[PDB]
Amino acid sequence: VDEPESMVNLAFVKNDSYEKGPDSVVVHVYVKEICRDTSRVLFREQDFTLIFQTRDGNFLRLHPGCGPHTTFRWQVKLRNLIEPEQCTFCFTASRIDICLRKRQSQRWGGLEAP
Numbered sequence: 001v002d003e004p005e006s007m008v009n010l011a012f013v014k015n016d017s018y019e020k021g022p023d024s025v026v027v028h029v030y031v032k033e034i035c036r037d038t039s040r041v042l043f044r045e046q047d048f049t050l051i052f053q054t055r056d057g058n059f060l061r062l063h064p065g066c067g068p069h070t071t072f073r074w075q076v077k078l079r080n081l082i083e084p085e086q087c088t089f090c091f092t093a094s095r096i097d098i099c100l101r102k103r104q105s106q107r108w109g110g111l112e113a114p
Contacts, residue, residue: 001035001053001068008072023105028090028097038071043084046104047077080104 017027031039031052039052051073060067083103090097 001038004038004053004069004071006070006072007051008070010072010074013074019102019106023102024099025102026097026099028092028095030095032094035068045084046079046081047075049073049075080106 013029014031015027015029017025019025029050031050031054033055035053035055039050042049042051051071053068053071055067060070078100080102081104083101086101086103088099090099
């Protein structure tokens, strides 16, 4: 767990996203059984990458050594840059809620009142 020497790209994600308010979008990703010591986030203007380790006995047992030496990342490039300065996070026991500010603005809301 000290030497990962591995970067795995994840193809399956467990989350749900929705846009809340005029300029805000808040999502919650289900990230559990994670070695928080190794759970890192690489974020920029509009995109972010989540790299971490977890424990899945069923999967890890199928490949001896996999798991504590396996570090993987999920990358999301969000469309319409966000303002990291205004961003906040929300931690539940098994899920991670995040409040994203869509400062690049969302277009077309239908009929708007002056």
